[PDB]
Design a protein around this ligand. Structure first.
Ligand SMILES: Cc1cn([C@H]2C[C@H](O)[C@@H](COP(=O)(O)OP(=O)(O)OP(=O)(O)O)O2)c(=O)[nH]c1=O
Ligand SMILES: Cc1cn([C@H]2C[C@H](O)[C@@H](COP(=O)(O)OP(=O)(O)OP(=O)(O)O)O2)c(=O)[nH]c1=O
Ligand SMILES: [Mg+2]
Ligand SMILES: [Mg+2]
Lengths: 226, 227
């Protein structure tokens, strides 16, 4: 196959989607073919659509999903509200495995943090990563609490031998400030910080997003992903 | 020895300090001798003092500190900013073991979440709980993200064989509302919810704090903590 990375996070709304876009954009600019899978999208009544964000910010066209729940809740509660079950583990795993091919960077986004339920019954993004042998990129904050959440997420990955490909600070404040500066230095002590996306990047137009994306990651690390 | 519980949380500001004071108050009203312990305190320059609050809300007088730092930062960064070192792991252990006593409940509040560095080098409250054979009471929010953080914390506890004495919801709103209510239902499927402390417990007076405390926990669970 090619390279598969789940893009998880220490929590909800930490920047997972804008980080998928940013890495997709840098990979494409490096001449790598990119696909992005978001198996379960919720909050569609208010128009949440993470694949649309990736398609618009980074230009990706191979964008796969399996389910769309209208309520703005976590996948299991939204599915409980709708009275319609989440997809099954095999559905999600085979979708990603069908996307993966040599020369392709395939990114997978779940919902919220690493352990929220993505498929019936109780299967997580960590389970999916195991079944498709993906490594994990962990999107973090630089705010109070991040080191604990980062360490807890990194331990949960190592507990099932899911490799950690790096950290990304999904939203880097301007100018950093005292906590954010201390938090970035300490995260850098426990894993490589691949990038720190400036705050508000997800509202850039595609041209600005691409230039920002190619400057945010290290040219060689992106080139070597596939 | 007696019974030692580390009181940790899914993060900082989730209610660890008010849960200590509530468990201490309920334990005391059952006849149980209580000590409370905070080996690392940051933010002294902003007035933060969890031991002092626990004394205020609950009337506990057996309160033991050790490391104190001016800045409201994570311990490592606060001690660094003050030209000080973190305490060594044996000093934290000594603090707790000196208080342990038969028939006494000792509560050890961390700083922030389970894996925050409390001692050189990379030593956490989980390591400390291992050293004193303590179980762990996990203070959680009912807000969004709580399920994932709670599951991550419980897994980190089990990997080191640190028994989990249950969850407590640090701040519980009246009325609940849909987000909190759903999360509390989902937390109870994960582990035992020992209490849900009403929002604003920390402002109650000693009389009302004791009433709230006695109502918040099952008395038979409180009494069963301590032989
Ligand atoms: C203003 C705002 C933007 N966004 C946008 C900007 C972020 O950089 C981007 C990616 O963050 P995500 O972590 O993916 O936030 P999300 O709601 O899409 O996360 P999840 O898929 O788990 O629900 O989404 C939010 O998610 N939440 C917000 O409150
Ligand atoms: C915002 C605020 C909260 N509190 C209360 C609300 C919480 O339920 C309680 C305990 O939260 P904790 O989890 O103990 O967090 P903390 O702020 O004490 O910091 P630390 O991680 O070092 O413990 O403190 C106050 O007493 N005064 C305040 O101004
Ligand atoms: Mg998203
Ligand atoms: Mg506290």
């Amino acid at each position: 196959g090619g390279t598969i990375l789940v893009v998880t996070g220490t929590g909800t709304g930490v920047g997972k989607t804008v980080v998928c876009a940013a890495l997709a954009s840098a990979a494409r600019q490096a001449g790598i073919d990119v696909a992005v899978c978001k198996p379960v999208q919720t909050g569609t009544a208010r128009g949440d659509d993470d694949l649309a964000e990736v398609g618009r910010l980074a230009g990706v066209t191979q964008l796969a999903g399996l389910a769309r729940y209208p309520q703005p809740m976590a996948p299991a509660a939204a599915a409980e509200h709708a009275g319609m079950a989440l997809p099954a583990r095999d559905q999600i795993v085979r979708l990603i495995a069908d996307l993966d091919r040599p020369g392709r960077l395939t990114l997978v986004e779940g919902a919220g943090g690493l352990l929220v339920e993505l498929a019936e019954p109780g299967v997580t993004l960590r389970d999916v990563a195991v079944d498709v042998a993906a490594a994990a990129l962990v999107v973090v904050t630089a705010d109070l609490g991040t080191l604990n959440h980062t360490k807890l997420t990194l331990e949960a990955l190592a507990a099932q031998q899911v490799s950690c490909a790096g950290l990304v600070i999904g939203s880097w404040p301007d100018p950093p400030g005292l906590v954010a500066a201390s938090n970035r230095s300490a995260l850098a002590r426990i894993a490589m910080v691949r990038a720190a996306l400036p705050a508000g990047a997800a509202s850039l137009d595609a041209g600005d997003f691409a230039a920002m994306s190619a400057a945010a990651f290290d040219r060689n690390w992106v080139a070597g992903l596939v």
